[PDB]
């Protein structure tokens, strides 16, 4: 624990500073240290954790896609052999990405999920588990690509089951979970019809519950509903 000597509260404070400075690797390391203090995370702290690692892995995924595209081109017919360098460097980025994903999955398994009893925390963490297995799936090609995909699906499914039982259809965590599970179906599991069906049902059931919300909750819910609609427009 490189952050083991820093107070939990100081780690959270510095995570917020790192965010303002757009230093997301630092933000992630501060939040990792905060999780490893062993106390449950508040709602704000959970979102600091997810924002930090989302930004880190998001940059890695963007770089991996650039490099994978170059690699695919250099492997086409008529291409000039430039040697092992493109593959080596894509592999380097891929390994770093897998390391970040394993770290996040490690925090969820030790011991954020098992200590999360409320729907709002348990669904949030299981959505994260699905998301980070999804990112591992995006780069997987070995004897365990199918097992990685099923690990993502399993986590997403447990989160959906809880969210449908315990949260209203407009809950932003429920909505965001369905958004991402829908993308999982479309992009990972090769189930575009399930992806479209999930996004549409999620949108329609949220629409019918908007009348119950305050202006501030309405804004939060309609924001994610628009992302569901955006994806449906991309897919139909």
């Amino acid at each position: 624990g490189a952050m083991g000597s820093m107070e939990r509260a100081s780690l959270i404070q510095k995570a917020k500073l790192a965010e303002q400075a757009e230093r997301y690797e630092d933000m992630a390391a501060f939040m990792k240290g905060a999780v490893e203090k062993g106390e449950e995370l508040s709602c704000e702290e959970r979102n600091l954790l997810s924002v930090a690692y989302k930004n880190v892995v998001g940059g890695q995924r963007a770089a991996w896609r650039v490099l994978s595209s170059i690699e695919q081109k250099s492997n086409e017919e008529g291409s000039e052999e430039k040697g092992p360098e493109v593959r080596e460097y894509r592999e380097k980025v891929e390994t770093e990405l897998q390391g970040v994903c394993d770290t996040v999955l490690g925090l969820l398994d030790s011991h954020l999920i098992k200590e999360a009893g409320d729907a709002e925390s348990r669904v949030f963490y299981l959505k994260m588990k699905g998301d980070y297995y999804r990112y591992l799936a995006e780069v997987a090609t070995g004897d365990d690509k199918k097992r990685i995909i099923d690990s993502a699906r399993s986590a997403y499914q447990e989160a959906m089951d809880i969210s449908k039982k315990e949260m209203p259809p407009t809950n932003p965590i429920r909505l965001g979970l369905a958004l991402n599970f829908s993308v999982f179906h479309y992009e990972i599991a090769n189930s575009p019809e399930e992806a479209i069906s999930l996004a549409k049902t999620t949108f329609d059931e949220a629409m019918a519950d908007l009348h119950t919300l305050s202006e501030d909750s309405y804004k939060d819910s309609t924001l994610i509903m628009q992302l569901l609609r955006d994806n449906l427009t991309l897919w139909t």
């Binding site: 958004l179 993308v183 479309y186 992302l227 955006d230 991309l234």
Partner: peptide, 5 residues
Amino acid sequence: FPATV
């Protein structure tokens, strides 16, 4: 790419 949060 499609939107995720």
